[PDB]
Amino acid sequence: VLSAADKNNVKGIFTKIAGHAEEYGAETLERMFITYPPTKTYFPHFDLSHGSAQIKGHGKKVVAALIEAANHIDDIAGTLSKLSDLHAHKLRVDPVNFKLLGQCFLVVVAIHHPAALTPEVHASLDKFLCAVGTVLTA
């Protein structure tokens, strides 16, 4: 599970993320769509060109949901269970895709806050993202 150090490491890095939800979320999605083009299949209703209004709005929601889970890190499943039915039942998102989006989020964090993303913080954030992915695929 998430240790006490994991939780403080995650909360610590998110003090740098929390003010950039739209910017970092949009960049995470744009990186995912360009690096892993098959992920575009889940967004046929979107304009997927750079900086489109739909990508910006959706990216803000994704990161906002992560911030929610960070604020209630003691029960991530309780905060995000409302997204489980959407992703696992309605959308049928292949579980491999959560690792792809998580990789893109870590790249965004590394680009903007390289000194904060130490090996130990990286380890904690990987466990946090894996825990979120398990809730959303449940």
Binding site: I34, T35, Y36, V107, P119, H122, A123
Partner: protein, 146 residues
């Protein structure tokens, strides 16, 4: 796989700016810290008992430089990667029995290390090309399993 002109430019262009020693040491240390089961393969390196020990271990640092130098052999002949990595495939598959999922994990860590070193110069298109490269190398490394 096939490589576009833009992909080749993104790969060779970034490669000339990579600190092979520092990025290689960092990627290997992150593998051992983020995915600690990988430490089982490196007991000959001695003290891997903490993040501090791993990051200061001279055998980890030396090995990480050799690993990234090999990625450079891929950069320097992108259409011949499978042959370039044939002997390394025998080592990792036949001798070490490293599960290929670990090759994917090292490649993903390398991308995060490159992103940290290059910041916004590591554009989405640059990440796409480098992610393709680490995937192609991982596939070549797993060849002797099939």
């Amino acid at each position: 796989v096939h490589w576009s002109a833009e992909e080749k430019q993104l790969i060779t262009g970034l490669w000339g700016k990579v600190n092979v020693a520092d990025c290689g040491a960092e990627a290997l240390a992150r593998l051992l810290i983020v995915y600690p089961w990988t430490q089982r393969f490196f007991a000959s390196f001695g003290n891997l008992s903490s993040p501090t020990a791993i990051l200061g271990n001279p055998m980890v640092r030396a090995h990480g430089k050799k690993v990234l130098t090999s990625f450079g052999d891929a950069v320097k002949n992108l259409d011949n990667i499978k042959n370039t990595f044939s002997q390394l495939s025998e080592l990792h598959c036949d001798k070490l029995h490293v599960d290929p999922e670990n090759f994917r994990l090292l490649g993903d860590i390398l991308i995060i290390v490159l992103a940290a070193h290059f910041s916004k110069d590591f554009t989405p298109e640059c990440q796409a090309a480098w992610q393709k490269l680490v995937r192609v190398v991982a596939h070549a490394l797993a060849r002797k399993y099939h």
